[PDB]
Structures are given as C-alpha cells and as structure tokens.
C-alpha cells in the first residue's frame, strides 16, 4: 500500500508515535517519505547482504529475520515480510524498539540527512489528526 501523507500521519498517531521518545509526528512522516516514499512494500539490499524492509526500511542484520542474513539478529522477533503489510502495526512496534536503543532517530540515515534540523511540522500541515 502507498499511503498518502495525512493518511500515514493519522495511522502513526493512532499507533502512538506522536512524541514517542520526544519525536514529533512530523519526524516520523518525514522519515517514511525519504526511506520508502510511503510504500509499505519497499525493499532495498545493502552491501553487507542485509536487506531493508517496509515503510521505515528496517534492517534484517539486527531487527527481523529474512532467512538469508547470516549471523544477524532478530531483535523485533518477527519475519521481515511482516514489515511489508498494509497494516503498519508491526513496523511501528519495531520502530519503537529501534528509537529507544540509545541513538534515537539517527538510526535512520535518511532522517539524519534529510529531516533532522528541518521544519518537520510541514509534513503534517493541513492534516485532520
Ligand atoms: Cl495501519
Ligand atoms: Cl533522542
Ligand atoms: Na511535527
Ligand atoms: Na536478522
């Protein structure tokens, strides 16, 4: 599913991401735009052989099991395919674990390079939330 901007903002609010660990909703919408273009099906392979999955591009080396990333961890205890669902629950629940692991949203490269230090509230402007 390819979400609209405000549709995704509302879904992420419903799932508790607004101000989660101090990150306002616009931060999460901005990260999703540049990680996946709001597409839950997005996948991208990394140089080390791991793969990123879903709307927030969660990496199989640490967070999910895809059966082809040797020695990796599954810290969210889920198959990576679960992160491609039109229902964002699994992606949100795993992202909550990631953002709490000490580095905040700096775990998402696109957030650090394209969202951090910008007017992220613009990503929720106009939306009914
Ligand atoms: Cl959803
Ligand atoms: Cl933080
Ligand atoms: Na915001
Ligand atoms: Na893994």
Swiss-Prot record:
PROSITE patterns: GLYCOSYL_HYDROL_F22_1, GLYCOSYL_HYDROL_F22_2. Residues 1-129 form the C-type lysozyme domain. GO terms for molecular function: beta-N-acetylglucosaminidase activity; identical protein binding; lysozyme activity. PANTHER family: LYSOZYME C (PTHR11407:SF28). Substrate binds at residue 101. SMART domains: LYZ1 (SM00263). InterPro entries: Glyco_hydro_22, Glyco_hydro_22_CS, Glyco_hydro_22_lys, Lysozyme-like_dom_sf. The keyword Transmembrane does not apply. This is Lysozyme C. It is an enzyme of class 3 (hydrolase). Its EC number is 3.2.1.17. The active site is at 35, 52. It catalyses: Hydrolysis of (1->4)-beta-linkages between N-acetylmuramic acid and N-acetyl-D-glucosamine residues in a peptidoglycan and between N-acetyl-D-glucosamine residues in chitodextrins. Disulfide bonds join 6-127, 30-115, 64-80, 76-94. It comes from Gallus gallus (Chicken). One of its GO terms (cellular component) is cytoplasm. Belongs to the glycosyl hydrolase 22 family. Monomer. Lysozymes have primarily a bacteriolytic function; those in tissues and body fluids are associated with the monocyte-macrophage system and enhance the activity of immunoagents. Has bacteriolytic activity against M.luteus. It is found in: Secreted. Keywords: Allergen, Antimicrobial, Bacteriolytic enzyme, Disulfide bond, Glycosidase, Hydrolase, Secreted, Signal. GO terms for biological process: cell wall macromolecule catabolic process; defense response to bacterium; defense response to Gram-negative bacterium; defense response to Gram-positive bacterium; killing of cells of another organism. Lysozyme C is capable of both hydrolysis and transglycosylation; it also shows a slight esterase activity. It acts rapidly on both peptide-substituted and unsubstituted peptidoglycan, and slowly on chitin oligosaccharides. In the egg white and polymorphonuclear leukocytes. The keyword Iron-sulfur does not apply.
